[PDB]
Amino acid sequence: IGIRLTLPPPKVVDRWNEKRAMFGVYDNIGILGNFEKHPKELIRGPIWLRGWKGNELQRCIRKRKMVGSRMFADDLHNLNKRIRYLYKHFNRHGKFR
Amino acid sequence: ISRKWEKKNKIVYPPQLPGEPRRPAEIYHCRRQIKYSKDKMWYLAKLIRGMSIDQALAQLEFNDKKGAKIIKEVLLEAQDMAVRDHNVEFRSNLYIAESTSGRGQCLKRIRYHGRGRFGIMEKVYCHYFVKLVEGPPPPPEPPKTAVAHAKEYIQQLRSRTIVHTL
Amino acid sequence: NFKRISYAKTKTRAEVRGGGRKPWPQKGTGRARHGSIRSPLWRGGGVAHGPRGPTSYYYMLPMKVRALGLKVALTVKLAQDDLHIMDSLELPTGDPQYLTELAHYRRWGDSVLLVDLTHEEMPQSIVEATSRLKTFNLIPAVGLNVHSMLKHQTLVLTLPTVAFLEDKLLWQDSRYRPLYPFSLPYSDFPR
Amino acid sequence: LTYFSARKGKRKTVKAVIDRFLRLHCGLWVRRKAGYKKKLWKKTPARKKRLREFVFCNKTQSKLLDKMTTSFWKRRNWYVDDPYQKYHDRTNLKV
Amino acid sequence: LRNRVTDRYFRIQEVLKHARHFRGRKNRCYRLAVRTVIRAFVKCTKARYLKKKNMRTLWINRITAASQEHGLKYPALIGNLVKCQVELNRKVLADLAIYEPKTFKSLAALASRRRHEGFAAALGDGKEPEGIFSRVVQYH
Amino acid sequence: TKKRFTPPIYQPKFK
Amino acid sequence: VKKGFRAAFRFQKELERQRLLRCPPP
Amino acid sequence: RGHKGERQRGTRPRLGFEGGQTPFYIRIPKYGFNEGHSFRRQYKPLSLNRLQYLIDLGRVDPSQPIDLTQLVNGRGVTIQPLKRDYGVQLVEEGADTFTAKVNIEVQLASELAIAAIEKNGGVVTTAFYDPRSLDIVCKPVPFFLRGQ
RNA sequence: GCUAAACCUAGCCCCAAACCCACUCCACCUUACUACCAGACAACCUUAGCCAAACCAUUUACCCAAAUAAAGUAUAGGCGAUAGAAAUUGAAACCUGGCGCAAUAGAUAUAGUACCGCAAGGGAAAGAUGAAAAAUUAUAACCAAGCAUAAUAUAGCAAGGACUAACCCCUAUACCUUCUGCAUAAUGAAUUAACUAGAAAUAACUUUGCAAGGAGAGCCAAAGCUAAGACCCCCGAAACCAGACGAGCUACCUAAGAACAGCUAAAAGAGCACACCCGUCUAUGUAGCAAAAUAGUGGGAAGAUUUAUAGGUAGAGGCGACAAACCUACCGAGCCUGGUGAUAGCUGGUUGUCCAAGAUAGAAUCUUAGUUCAACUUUAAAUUUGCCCACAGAACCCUCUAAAUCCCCUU
RNA sequence: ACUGAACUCCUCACACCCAAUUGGACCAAUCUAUCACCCUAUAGAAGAACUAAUGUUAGUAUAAGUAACAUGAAAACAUUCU
RNA sequence: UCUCUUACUUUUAACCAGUGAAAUUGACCUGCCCGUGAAGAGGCGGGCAUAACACAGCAAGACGAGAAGACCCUAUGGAGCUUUAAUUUAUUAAUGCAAACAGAAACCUGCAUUAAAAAUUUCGGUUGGGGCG
Ligand SMILES: [K+]
Ligand SMILES: [K+]
Ligand SMILES: [K+]
Ligand SMILES: [Mg+2]
Ligand SMILES: [Mg+2]
Ligand SMILES: [Mg+2]
Ligand SMILES: [Mg+2]
Ligand SMILES: [Mg+2]
Ligand SMILES: [Mg+2]
Ligand SMILES: [Mg+2]
Ligand SMILES: [Mg+2]
Ligand SMILES: [Mg+2]
Ligand SMILES: [Mg+2]
Ligand SMILES: [Mg+2]
Ligand SMILES: [Mg+2]
Ligand SMILES: [Mg+2]
Ligand SMILES: [Mg+2]
Ligand SMILES: [Mg+2]
Ligand SMILES: [Mg+2]
Ligand SMILES: [Mg+2]
Ligand SMILES: [Mg+2]
Ligand SMILES: [Mg+2]
Ligand SMILES: [Mg+2]
Ligand SMILES: [Mg+2]
Ligand SMILES: [Mg+2]
Ligand SMILES: [Mg+2]
Ligand SMILES: [Mg+2]
Ligand SMILES: [Mg+2]
Ligand SMILES: [Mg+2]
Ligand SMILES: [Mg+2]
Ligand SMILES: [Mg+2]
Ligand SMILES: [Mg+2]
Ligand SMILES: [Mg+2]
Ligand SMILES: [Mg+2]
Ligand SMILES: [Mg+2]
Ligand SMILES: [Mg+2]
Ligand SMILES: [Mg+2]
Ligand SMILES: [Mg+2]
Ligand SMILES: [Mg+2]
Ligand SMILES: [Mg+2]
Ligand SMILES: [Mg+2]
Ligand SMILES: [Mg+2]
Ligand SMILES: [Mg+2]
Ligand SMILES: [Mg+2]
Ligand SMILES: [Mg+2]
Ligand SMILES: [Mg+2]
Ligand SMILES: [Mg+2]
Ligand SMILES: [Mg+2]
Ligand SMILES: [Mg+2]
Ligand SMILES: [Mg+2]
Ligand SMILES: [Mg+2]
Ligand SMILES: [Mg+2]
Ligand SMILES: [Mg+2]
């Protein structure tokens, strides 16, 4: 019980597809391009996460002040509660002071 | 679910050599989803375990339990199946080799108790398995006699060595 | 890892729909005490410590560290007979079969990374030959990176590319600390 | 102490420490004596002499005040004609 | 990424295999068997001291049994064999008392003779010479 | 010592 | 259906050993 | 995490709390140690050893007038106008070994540093720069990109 | 060999991009889904509280329309927990993605359906052959607990040492948690499978880069600076506030109705006694027929009676022949949703292997169920003495003329 | 005299018997990069490991085949009887 | 009712047939005496007893089971209620003034003072069984 009786379907990974053969390209755009571009500008994803890093509370705070006016009512309410809980957890709970 | 009992009637052995002895016939038969308790059904299967095919029918015909009539119908169609399909010459030259009962799928209903309480009651179903082997039933094992006990006790005293030494 | 963004995200006990009501009274029922049906203990509840995406793993190594890695990567290629210098990427024929057979005769390797000075000056002979290939990649000089070189067995460079690399790489070894980002005009930048 | 602010997500500084203490760049914290302005008529001149002195906090107190202030207060300042300028660095200190 | 235990079956079989010979539900239920396999292993480690202790006690009883057949006590045999520089442990003497009855009787005679020599020396004041078997070989 | 009453909790009928 | 291959592969070897016990080869 | 209490449950009190008694930092009286700290003027010191070090390496050419722009352009100083900097002050460190004829303009200068420069034939003049113009002087290139 | 066990899709999550749907016919604000008569009916009004301040009473973060920086700075504040700018600086921007999930997961979802509640509202469970089912002669073997095959033989945490041999002999006071100390007759666990609990980089340390400079504007620098690695859990209250939903049970009231044999008496909140209502005593029952009943015995039974129907009063309240009664089977303050993952110095739990170091001076505290500091303990680092202890030396008013310390070179 | 320990010795190997806490050395499975190609290597990453929370869901035991439950009689199943 | 119970019928009961729960359960191969122990032992020490085995009774034990029981204590945990506890008059009502008017007044609004009715919050530790700390 809890373990399959048959082998999993075989998985074949294309080590030389378009994405892997061209992964990491232009990571030296700033060094080799007279510093016109920055490698952080090559990041694709959320507008509040391009070229930025932080903990869970900092991500929620940054997301609320950048796309908070565009979020859905349910999602915005959940984000506000998450900030309230994380504020209480980090600033009032822990092993070290 | 498992239905290996039915497949046991489809195994075909290779033809026997002229010097090989007569191999008794093996018949596997069962009935599924019998509205009866496997605990109560066990006493009926144990009663006819080791009995002859005709002797077992005699016990099940005058037995007051409901499953006795259910098992009898299983033996009657298995006895007919033995001669018709399994090349058994005499229908009475059979004995019950294996006779057991198995748990079947059971529905779950609610039995209402007092004070707004409840208790889940199942509608128990059971299986019955029977195996028929051509030939007379094996003789019952004789009770162990005093000579056998004396022979065994003396044999124990002869197999003892000096332990924890050379 | 610097451009990795993890989109995995789970719903905590505050985001699972429903579960605001206490199931049974605290005492008298003879069962375990629970305040909601969406707690991590319950089936179908939230996850106590799960991913909270989207998450960024962005960090920047110092510029001299990233530039030094290219020199070390280039040193390994030359020291291990995996670096080849060329004058131009002009092939006699645009047949991709010609490129594969040429690399096998010289025993370059299973994979070769081709580098040109610029993207607009790449000869059409090699562009149409590497377009149908998977182990032979054609990239500009600015697209040079450590991961691509380490993935590929053999590296091929042109003469203009070599001069380009030395100007860019040695510039880090003798330079002042930036008062303002180098994208702004300087006395001697760009070179 | 607020380890993560609700609008910037960064550590804050307790203003009670800043007003009551002075930090030298060498790591020492300089404070006043509790009660140097209270009931001076019943205190001997020797007692009052050490009450109006500036004293250094010990290791435990100094480590406590380093966590309650941000890095803006630990930077090196170059105020013109600073009374405590000469005390921002240790001299002939071993171990 | 969600990680789940996929080889939990192998983690419980390495403990249940040591419990296959037990009785009751503690041979197939992991929760019940793990508390019994641990105690079985603990008893295994602590029984290594008892086995050494019990072997020596068994040897003493066998040595005592054979000495009484020759009219000697266990202290009279072990004690007087030491004074003859015969360094035989209980394992050998127990084996000798079972498989070499004639050799054991010779040792009993030697121990009895040495025992009698000490009594004679105890009656005298040292003027008489020591017993023939009471001489000790010196090693330098 | 208030009167203690525990209301029985029924289970869903689908089971 | 838990993902992975090492646990499923390892279990198959154990099953084959039981097959060699219930029905040993000649 | 230990045995029970506020340690294991993660409900430890705030930093500086002493279990109920008046905290150590609270009981210390207030004094004007840092009062008006953000309005005090700061000047990055410039030693004659540092100035002579720049001249001998060619980072600061003595043939041209020396102002705050040249010192920043030579990476001799790092002025932070946002950090209440008002320029550089010329200190007297290394006056004995200073030997160069320069025309350097510094916001503040000590009496000995002034004497040391004029002894070798140099000229020293002190001028004031407001914080707004200070950032323009330190980094002229970013200012010229604002189109103002 | 039964029950079972496995079997991958449905679909979903997070981003990006782009601003979305809403007249076939008929019906639908009256009792919605009802073809068809004189109406007058109007929307707008600071959130609070939990919580933190170890109580609490001022106070306590909540997108407000440019990221970064200025900056956690100026200021605000039982100047205390905490709150917190601006001038100024200026940003790239290519939807067609995944070191996301794979049926106890991912949306609750096969579905807001079944079902539950008068209503608001709560809220599921599960599916699995194959190219072909117009191949069922089918989708073979092995796998949890539970059973069956196959009941049991002196004796004892059920095992270990063993043995020719299952037992017989010898040895052995279950586990976790909480306590100074649990075989303890203290807590938890019938069992199987799955799920379920340590998130943060200020300082310091470690390892690279560069170096009086470091850094891809800002920031720091009297060897620093940049980057990485590496430390901070889960479940549980009784409560509080806001907005809704409830008087089809019940408390009282309103509208217009109905019921009350017979006998004795008299124009009776009269007597006896049915229907009817009520529930005194006793017994049965106690997961019961019943989350308050049965049998017998009782109180009233022309009235302050009983009762059907419709309407009204709603929680900071209603209502009350005041019992702190009743307000939809837990009312000293209803239920539901939201704040809410409220909080809990309290209880319980806190998941792989191996090794090492490792226990009992105290002070403060609305504090003695806690916390902080010290003592002790750990690692790393630096340095040179540490321990043991020969004389000498340490008070008088004081002969319990005490045992013995402190100091202390040698060793 | 002898008996008598995990003390000591002997043959051999030695990191291999403390709560809390602290320092380590390793490591299951999973995903990714690159290998590997009967299931592994080196790295990166994390919903990363359950004999226990009157834990949650599901299955099945135990109490237990126990408590409890039910159909007036004859008959031609027309009917009749109690 | 009792001295002092007894007989009978019915239900229950027990047996045969059918259907088929619930609390409970660490694992048990589940003995007595004496002693010991976290102070009340089926499991430890010393003695004694002991083939296995179901059914029907019994209620001394398993500190038996059932609702973290009642009972005292603890919490800088709640709530109701009372008040000469503390903090307030926002709200309501009555006056005063200003305002606004007529020529006097009222309504309204602002600011005050009185009450009313409420709102928020707390109940320091130490020691003391027959006290008045
Ligand atoms: K669900
Ligand atoms: K406490
Ligand atoms: K009893
Ligand atoms: Mg019923
Ligand atoms: Mg009912
Ligand atoms: Mg909720
Ligand atoms: Mg709520
Ligand atoms: Mg709760
Ligand atoms: Mg979920
Ligand atoms: Mg010994
Ligand atoms: Mg605990
Ligand atoms: Mg009409
Ligand atoms: Mg009409
Ligand atoms: Mg508070
Ligand atoms: Mg309180
Ligand atoms: Mg689901
Ligand atoms: Mg099984
Ligand atoms: Mg024994
Ligand atoms: Mg309200
Ligand atoms: Mg009504
Ligand atoms: Mg009448
Ligand atoms: Mg009357
Ligand atoms: Mg009434
Ligand atoms: Mg009464
Ligand atoms: Mg009634
Ligand atoms: Mg009457
Ligand atoms: Mg109504
Ligand atoms: Mg009434
Ligand atoms: Mg009263
Ligand atoms: Mg009362
Ligand atoms: Mg209610
Ligand atoms: Mg909590
Ligand atoms: Mg140790
Ligand atoms: Mg106090
Ligand atoms: Mg040993
Ligand atoms: Mg030793
Ligand atoms: Mg050793
Ligand atoms: Mg790995
Ligand atoms: Mg986990
Ligand atoms: Mg498990
Ligand atoms: Mg559990
Ligand atoms: Mg029974
Ligand atoms: Mg019965
Ligand atoms: Mg009947
Ligand atoms: Mg029956
Ligand atoms: Mg049950
Ligand atoms: Mg027995
Ligand atoms: Mg006893
Ligand atoms: Mg005993
Ligand atoms: Mg019995
Ligand atoms: Mg009874
Ligand atoms: Mg307290
Ligand atoms: Mg308040």
mmCIF file with all atom_site columns, C-alpha atoms (C1' of nucleotides) in Angstrom, chain I residues 314-376:
data_model
loop_
_atom_site.group_PDB
_atom_site.id
_atom_site.type_symbol
_atom_site.label_atom_id
_atom_site.label_alt_id
_atom_site.label_comp_id
_atom_site.label_asym_id
_atom_site.label_entity_id
_atom_site.label_seq_id
_atom_site.pdbx_PDB_ins_code
_atom_site.Cartn_x
_atom_site.Cartn_y
_atom_site.Cartn_z
_atom_site.occupancy
_atom_site.B_iso_or_equiv
_atom_site.pdbx_formal_charge
_atom_site.auth_seq_id
_atom_site.auth_comp_id
_atom_site.auth_asym_id
_atom_site.auth_atom_id
_atom_site.pdbx_PDB_model_num
ATOM 1  C "C1'" . A I 1 314 ? -34.574 41.624 17.913 1.00 0.00 ? 314 A I "C1'" 1
ATOM 2  C "C1'" . G I 1 315 ? -29.393 41.596 21.150 1.00 0.00 ? 315 G I "C1'" 1
ATOM 3  C "C1'" . A I 1 316 ? -26.136 48.357 23.837 1.00 0.00 ? 316 A I "C1'" 1
ATOM 4  C "C1'" . G I 1 317 ? -32.463 44.727 22.623 1.00 0.00 ? 317 G I "C1'" 1
ATOM 5  C "C1'" . G I 1 318 ? -37.152 42.193 23.164 1.00 0.00 ? 318 G I "C1'" 1
ATOM 6  C "C1'" . C I 1 319 ? -40.339 40.262 26.737 1.00 0.00 ? 319 C I "C1'" 1
ATOM 7  C "C1'" . G I 1 320 ? -41.314 38.885 31.797 1.00 0.00 ? 320 G I "C1'" 1
ATOM 8  C "C1'" . A I 1 321 ? -48.187 37.061 37.521 1.00 0.00 ? 321 A I "C1'" 1
ATOM 9  C "C1'" . C I 1 322 ? -38.936 38.428 38.808 1.00 0.00 ? 322 C I "C1'" 1
ATOM 10 C "C1'" . A I 1 323 ? -37.826 32.091 37.828 1.00 0.00 ? 323 A I "C1'" 1
ATOM 11 C "C1'" . A I 1 324 ? -31.671 36.104 36.431 1.00 0.00 ? 324 A I "C1'" 1
ATOM 12 C "C1'" . A I 1 325 ? -37.441 32.963 33.248 1.00 0.00 ? 325 A I "C1'" 1
ATOM 13 C "C1'" . C I 1 326 ? -37.934 33.071 27.766 1.00 0.00 ? 326 C I "C1'" 1
ATOM 14 C "C1'" . C I 1 327 ? -36.181 34.967 22.755 1.00 0.00 ? 327 C I "C1'" 1
ATOM 15 C "C1'" . U I 1 328 ? -35.589 27.842 17.205 1.00 0.00 ? 328 U I "C1'" 1
ATOM 16 C "C1'" . A I 1 329 ? -33.527 21.236 21.545 1.00 0.00 ? 329 A I "C1'" 1
ATOM 17 C "C1'" . C I 1 330 ? -25.761 24.270 25.786 1.00 0.00 ? 330 C I "C1'" 1
ATOM 18 C "C1'" . C I 1 331 ? -29.143 32.780 26.915 1.00 0.00 ? 331 C I "C1'" 1
ATOM 19 C "C1'" . G I 1 332 ? -25.667 36.358 33.514 1.00 0.00 ? 332 G I "C1'" 1
ATOM 20 C "C1'" . A I 1 333 ? -26.823 38.104 27.333 1.00 0.00 ? 333 A I "C1'" 1
ATOM 21 C "C1'" . G I 1 334 ? -29.280 34.502 20.481 1.00 0.00 ? 334 G I "C1'" 1
ATOM 22 C "C1'" . C I 1 335 ? -27.195 32.833 15.925 1.00 0.00 ? 335 C I "C1'" 1
ATOM 23 C "C1'" . C I 1 336 ? -24.361 33.781 11.504 1.00 0.00 ? 336 C I "C1'" 1
ATOM 24 C "C1'" . U I 1 337 ? -20.529 36.338 8.768  1.00 0.00 ? 337 U I "C1'" 1
ATOM 25 C "C1'" . G I 1 338 ? -16.398 39.642 9.126  1.00 0.00 ? 338 G I "C1'" 1
ATOM 26 C "C1'" . G I 1 339 ? -12.268 41.950 11.839 1.00 0.00 ? 339 G I "C1'" 1
ATOM 27 C "C1'" . U I 1 340 ? -9.427  36.623 12.758 1.00 0.00 ? 340 U I "C1'" 1
ATOM 28 C "C1'" . G I 1 341 ? -4.209  32.672 11.567 1.00 0.00 ? 341 G I "C1'" 1
ATOM 29 C "C1'" . A I 1 342 ? -7.940  37.586 17.954 1.00 0.00 ? 342 A I "C1'" 1
ATOM 30 C "C1'" . U I 1 343 ? -4.884  36.578 22.255 1.00 0.00 ? 343 U I "C1'" 1
ATOM 31 C "C1'" . A I 1 344 ? -3.380  32.876 25.875 1.00 0.00 ? 344 A I "C1'" 1
ATOM 32 C "C1'" . G I 1 345 ? 3.434   33.993 31.074 1.00 0.00 ? 345 G I "C1'" 1
ATOM 33 C "C1'" . C I 1 346 ? -1.563  28.057 30.296 1.00 0.00 ? 346 C I "C1'" 1
ATOM 34 C "C1'" . U I 1 347 ? -2.120  22.508 28.194 1.00 0.00 ? 347 U I "C1'" 1
ATOM 35 C "C1'" . G I 1 348 ? -0.598  19.204 24.357 1.00 0.00 ? 348 G I "C1'" 1
ATOM 36 C "C1'" . G I 1 349 ? 2.612   18.184 20.149 1.00 0.00 ? 349 G I "C1'" 1
ATOM 37 C "C1'" . U I 1 350 ? 7.293   19.540 17.947 1.00 0.00 ? 350 U I "C1'" 1
ATOM 38 C "C1'" . U I 1 351 ? 9.488   13.969 12.003 1.00 0.00 ? 351 U I "C1'" 1
ATOM 39 C "C1'" . G I 1 352 ? 16.891  11.008 9.343  1.00 0.00 ? 352 G I "C1'" 1
ATOM 40 C "C1'" . U I 1 353 ? 21.852  8.921  11.252 1.00 0.00 ? 353 U I "C1'" 1
ATOM 41 C "C1'" . C I 1 354 ? 26.351  9.360  14.189 1.00 0.00 ? 354 C I "C1'" 1
ATOM 42 C "C1'" . C I 1 355 ? 29.907  11.804 17.513 1.00 0.00 ? 355 C I "C1'" 1
ATOM 43 C "C1'" . A I 1 356 ? 31.425  15.525 21.024 1.00 0.00 ? 356 A I "C1'" 1
ATOM 44 C "C1'" . A I 1 357 ? 31.125  19.412 25.263 1.00 0.00 ? 357 A I "C1'" 1
ATOM 45 C "C1'" . G I 1 358 ? 27.481  19.859 28.963 1.00 0.00 ? 358 G I "C1'" 1
ATOM 46 C "C1'" . A I 1 359 ? 23.614  20.675 36.213 1.00 0.00 ? 359 A I "C1'" 1
ATOM 47 C "C1'" . U I 1 360 ? 21.717  23.773 41.475 1.00 0.00 ? 360 U I "C1'" 1
ATOM 48 C "C1'" . A I 1 361 ? 25.677  31.150 43.651 1.00 0.00 ? 361 A I "C1'" 1
ATOM 49 C "C1'" . G I 1 362 ? 22.023  35.411 43.313 1.00 0.00 ? 362 G I "C1'" 1
ATOM 50 C "C1'" . A I 1 363 ? 19.487  40.313 42.284 1.00 0.00 ? 363 A I "C1'" 1
ATOM 51 C "C1'" . A I 1 364 ? 15.214  42.972 40.328 1.00 0.00 ? 364 A I "C1'" 1
ATOM 52 C "C1'" . U I 1 365 ? 10.154  42.174 38.961 1.00 0.00 ? 365 U I "C1'" 1
ATOM 53 C "C1'" . C I 1 366 ? 1.519   44.273 39.982 1.00 0.00 ? 366 C I "C1'" 1
ATOM 54 C "C1'" . U I 1 367 ? 7.059   39.213 40.574 1.00 0.00 ? 367 U I "C1'" 1
ATOM 55 C "C1'" . U I 1 368 ? 7.707   34.061 42.607 1.00 0.00 ? 368 U I "C1'" 1
ATOM 56 C "C1'" . A I 1 369 ? 3.446   28.817 36.482 1.00 0.00 ? 369 A I "C1'" 1
ATOM 57 C "C1'" . G I 1 370 ? 7.179   34.312 33.751 1.00 0.00 ? 370 G I "C1'" 1
ATOM 58 C "C1'" . U I 1 371 ? 11.050  37.434 32.173 1.00 0.00 ? 371 U I "C1'" 1
ATOM 59 C "C1'" . U I 1 372 ? 15.786  40.345 32.341 1.00 0.00 ? 372 U I "C1'" 1
ATOM 60 C "C1'" . C I 1 373 ? 20.807  40.462 34.268 1.00 0.00 ? 373 C I "C1'" 1
ATOM 61 C "C1'" . A I 1 374 ? 24.620  37.770 36.671 1.00 0.00 ? 374 A I "C1'" 1
ATOM 62 C "C1'" . A I 1 375 ? 26.499  32.814 37.812 1.00 0.00 ? 375 A I "C1'" 1
ATOM 63 C "C1'" . C I 1 376 ? 27.032  28.367 35.062 1.00 0.00 ? 376 C I "C1'" 1
#
